[PDB]
């Protein structure tokens, strides 16, 4: 069934599961033509496929060539997403395949379900949560690998860096969702918070700064302030 606030701890049990977000698969800039009409130019995108328990991120880069000569691209994007997720599952050993795939947008249910007909024991589920995974292209290293791609490419990351050595996956997911919510609500401010101090670095093999436990509390506190504010600046309160 649908994933919501009530069954949130299920994300961190020992049944393998993946979130799939398709927001950033088909991306365009809209511009004027010489004749004064409007046209779109596509840019590279990505499927965001995340194991919330382990932090393993399967980032399938979608190169603009996959749209050449195709119609109804927003619709095709959902089926392309489902085809790539299906290909990913088939590439994993049986004992690594997910038992559930949770899609962040309901329009992905039927495309994924049809592509996964071969896997009747994998549950395809929606969610009621408003998860901020679109903001993954606000993470600099992830954006950089997507824009530089010259061909289809899968890139593997751990979106939690080394956090699981010190915190649980519940706490790591909550940190991730807070960082991404902040980046989505006010990217510039959020990015100021994370690196305005020049002595805290991002390791070459990591995505986020090497904060101590105490600095993470400060950082997390600053992100919640941002989110509350912008919610005022937005609604005037």
């Amino acid at each position: 069934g649908a994933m919501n606030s009530s069954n949130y701890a299920e994300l961190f049990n020992n049944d393998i599961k993946l979130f799939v977000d398709d927001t950033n698969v088909y991306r365009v800039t809209v511009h004027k033509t010489f004749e004064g009409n409007v046209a779109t130019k596509a840019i590279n995108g990505c499927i965001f496929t995340l194991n919330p328990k382990t932090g393993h991120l399967f980032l399938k880069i979608i190169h603009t060539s996959v749209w050449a000569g195709q119609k109804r691209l927003s619709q095709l994007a959902k089926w392309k997403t489902a085809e790539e997720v299906s290909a990913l599952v088939r590439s994993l050993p049986k004992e690594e395949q997910p038992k559930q795939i949770i899609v962040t947008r309901k329009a992905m249910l039927d495309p994924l379900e049809v592509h996964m007909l071969d896997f009747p024991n994998i549950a395809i589920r929606p969610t009621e949560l408003r998860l901020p995974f679109s903001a993954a292209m606000s993470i600099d290293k992830l954006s950089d690998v997507v824009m530089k791609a010259t061909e289809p490419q899968m890139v593997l990351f751990n979106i939690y860096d080394d956090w699981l050595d010190r915190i649980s996956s519940y706490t790591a997911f909550s940190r991730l969702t807070l960082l991404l919510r902040a980046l989505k609500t006010n990217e510039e401010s959020a990015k100021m918070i994370l690196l305005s101090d020049p002595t805290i670095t991002i390791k070459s093999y990591h995505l986020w700064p090497s904060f101590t436990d105490e600095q993470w509390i400060t950082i997390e506190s600053q992100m919640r302030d941002l989110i509350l504010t912008e919610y005022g600046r937005k609604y005037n309160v």
Binding site: D110, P111, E113, V114, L117
Partner: protein, 300 residues
């Protein structure tokens, strides 16, 4: 013109014969129905006055035998039976006609309704959907479930309609996932028409039979089947032109005949709005769209 003799009418019952119906009182001197047109299947159906629960009835074709109705007080229903003794039957019928104990199948001469509702329905195909091979006629009632319903429980008492499922390996060619899901022509023309039904007449016959069981018995699984068979054609970009023209005629007469007060349960809003306004064939059902818009504009 043939006759179906009733042994008696011991319980008050509304009797249907095709799209006609009449009331019979407890122990009324009623001995059957005469002047039944040859050349068509027919259905004779029952709703007891005391228990509107369970509409039930029998599909039959008088060319296949001499059939009569006799009430069974143990099982509590009117049962169809075959009389194998031809001279016994003729003598039975002639006596009741002489005593004018029978109602007349009341067909208006201009009226093609029943032909138009049963054009492609054959008894031999009914008997494969309703399996009871010791009889030449077929029992159906409001509660019988379909094979597909059982998968989602008595196999002997099921409606064995052709299983249609748009998210199934039969419907979706590996590697044509998006193509086959958004344009069901493969599934309609290759899997179902060429593979399973053999021709469109058998397809239309099952569609018509499913509608009639939905209308006369309120059979929910039959209504599901009728809508699924409509949707499979409407959701196909490539349909033979003769099939579309015949479908429009079929549906038109079904909508024409439907009780105005049953449209709330017998018509699926989603299927009809999709078929008439969003599907590949949205512009191919002129007669059906005009009668639906003038008779059930609320649904849409």
């Amino acid at each position: 013109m043939n006759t179906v003799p009733f042994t008696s009418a011991p319980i008050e019952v509304t009797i249907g014969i095709d799209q006609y119906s009449f009331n019979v009182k407890e122990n009324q001197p009623f001995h059957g129905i005469k002047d039944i047109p040859i050349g068509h299947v027919h259905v004779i159906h029952f709703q007891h006055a005391d228990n509107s629960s369970m509409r039930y009835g029998y599909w039959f074709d008088c060319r296949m035998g001499n059939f009569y109705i006799q009430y069974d007080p143990k099982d509590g229903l009117y049962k169809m039976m075959e009389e194998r003794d031809g001279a016994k039957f003729e003598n039975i019928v002639h006596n009741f006609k002489e005593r004018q104990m029978m109602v007349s199948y009341p067909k208006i001469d201009e009226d093609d309704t029943w032909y138009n509702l049963t054009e492609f329905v054959q008894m031999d195909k009914i008997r494969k959907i309703v399996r009871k091979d010791e009889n030449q006629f077929s029992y159906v009632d409001s509660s019988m479930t379909t094979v597909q319903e059982n998968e989602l429980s008595d196999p002997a008492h099921s409606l064995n309609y052709t299983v249609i499922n748009f998210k199934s390996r039969e419907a979706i060619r590996p590697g044509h996932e998006m193509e086959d899901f958004l344009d069901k022509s493969y599934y309609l023309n290759t899997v179902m028409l060429q593979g399973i039904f053999k021709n469109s007449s058998n397809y239309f016959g099952e569609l018509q039979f499913a509608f009639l069981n939905a209308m006369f018995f309120g059979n929910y699984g039959s209504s599901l089947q009728w809508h699924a068979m409509i949707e499979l054609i409407c959701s196909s970009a490539t349909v033979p032109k003769h099939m579309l023209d015949k479908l429009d005629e079929i549906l038109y007469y079904q909508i024409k005949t439907l009780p105005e007060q049953y449209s709330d349960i017998l018509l699926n809003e989603r299927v009809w709005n999709i078929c008439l306004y969003s599907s590949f064939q949205k512009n191919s059902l002129h007669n059906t769209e005009k009668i639906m818009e003038n008779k059930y504009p609320e649904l849409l």
